[PDB]
């Protein structure tokens, strides 16, 4: 999205906030649970089409609220939300339920990663793999010799009311999921922002596959460098949210998996995780062998991914009771120069007494509609 320099109005959103039952979880080991205890304050700054309410909009009506619950976090905004300004509007348009979750950076069994201090995190995600953001926030509390003073949001969020919070750093994406074709170009979608008081060191892009997360691209101190493939643009300056996308040349099989966009700042770091699937749509050709008392059906199904497309033959008569063929056979599963897969299949036809129709049907996840081909078989006596 272009920076919000047009006509817009900020609105106040409240989302149900989950909290892990740490020490009282359904399972054995967890730092997350889908159970609400409070809400978070969210900001949205959508672009207005009508302005029918002058200084407001119901664009985010599905999430908008005026009534604050007994417990709610201020989640003050010291950084740019623009990339997500319509994230909840799009959710409402798609009818996708939106939730959020709060947790802590505090560790008791070991050394606190943020040097024991009242620092917390808050995540917001749209159901169905929609827009996602992870907020990094602080609470202005002070202690000298205390252990649990944060408080640690456990079990209860607070003995009373709610502690103040403010976001100084966040990482966001438009999607938790991507889909491309094998051999086709691609890109990753992500970005981030921060308070003026926080600087940026580097951003890394990694691929999760084959038992290891591996670097594919990095950007450090103004200099971009690929180690496998891809290219980026220079991050924005303070005043606008910074991009963290990655342009990817034609993808191959090895490039399938889950991509992680990692941002490291002068104080803190965070990442989003985006799954990228690759597919290819089968193509089908069919021909009937000439002559023979039992003409052979030959069909090739090529240029698909992943391997082992499902193929079924059908036999239809001039009335009677048409039925599927559970026999036939397949062979010759192989790859092409494109990385795609191909497979062959054949069936011995019975011309019948007055002719018969044969079809080779193909089923694949990449096929919105059934794919296959038909041919007629003509008895020797019907030529």
């Amino acid at each position: 999205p272009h920076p919000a320099e047009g006509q817009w109005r900020a609105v106040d959103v409240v989302l149900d906030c989950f909290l892990v039952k740490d020490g009282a979880h359904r399972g054995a080991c967890a730092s997350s649970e889908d159970r609400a205890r409070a809400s978070l304050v969210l900001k949205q700054v959508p672009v207005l089409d009508d302005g029918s309410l002058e200084d407001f909009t119901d664009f985010q009506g599905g999430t908008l609220a005026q009534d604050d619950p007994p417990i709610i976090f201020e989640a003050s905004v010291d950084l740019v939300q623009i990339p997500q300004a319509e994230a909840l509007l799009h959710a409402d348009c798609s009818g996708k339920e939106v939730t959020c979750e709060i947790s802590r950076y505090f560790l008791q069994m070991t050394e606190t990663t943020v040097k024991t201090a009242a620092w917390f995190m808050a995540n917001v995600q749209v159901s169905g793999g929609g827009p996602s953001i992870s907020l990094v926030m602080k609470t202005p509390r002070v202690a000298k010799n205390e252990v649990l003073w944060h408080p640690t949001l456990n079990l209860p969020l607070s003995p009373q009311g709610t502690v103040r919070t403010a976001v100084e750093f966040q990482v966001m994406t438009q999607t938790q999921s991507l889909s491309f074709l094998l051999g086709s170009s691609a890109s990753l979608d992500c970005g981030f922002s921060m308070a003026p008081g926080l600087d940026l060191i580097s951003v890394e892009w990694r691929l999760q596959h084959k038992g290891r997360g591996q670097l594919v691209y990095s950007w450090t101190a103004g200099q971009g460098q690929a180690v496998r493939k891809g290219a980026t643009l220079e991050p924005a300056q303070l005043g606008m949210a910074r991009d963290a996308s990655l342009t990817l040349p034609g993808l191959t099989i090895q490039d399938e998996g889950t991509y992680i966009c990692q941002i490291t700042t002068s104080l803190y770091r965070a990442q989003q995780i985006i799954q990228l699937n690759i597919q290819a749509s089968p193509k089908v050709r069919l021909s009937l062998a000439n002559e023979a008392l039992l003409p052979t059906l030959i069909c090739d199904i090529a240029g698909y991914y992943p391997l082992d497309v499902v193929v079924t033959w059908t036999r239809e008569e001039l009335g009677g009771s048409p039925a599927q063929v559970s026999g036939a056979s397949f062979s010759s599963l192989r790859q092409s120069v494109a990385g795609t897969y191909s497979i062959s299949s054949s069936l011995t036809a019975e011309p019948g007494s007055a002719g018969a129709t044969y079809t080779c049907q193909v089923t694949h996840i990449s096929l919105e509609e059934p794919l296959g081909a038909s041919t007629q078989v003509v008895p020797p006596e019907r030529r």
């Binding site: 038992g211 056979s329 062979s331 599963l333 054949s346």
Partner: protein, 97 residues
Amino acid sequence: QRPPKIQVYSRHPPEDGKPNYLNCYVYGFHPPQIEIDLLKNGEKIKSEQSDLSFSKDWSFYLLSHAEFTPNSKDQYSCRVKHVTLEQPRIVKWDRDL
């Protein structure tokens, strides 16, 4: 479920009057509940099945082989059974001729 992928091949180029060995390679299947049947003209022939090995791709490998006498007049095929499939997979071999 991971539907098995199947290929059939000889150990050496078949030739009439020259007894040979028939392999079938089944890979990418899960769970590892596979039984491989090698057949001649639709009839099961003497065969053996080896260990089921792990893959990095969450799947297993399996090799099975059989003894036969090559014959250009005859046809050969393989069927692979899988507990979690409604119907065994049927694959045709071109006799490597």
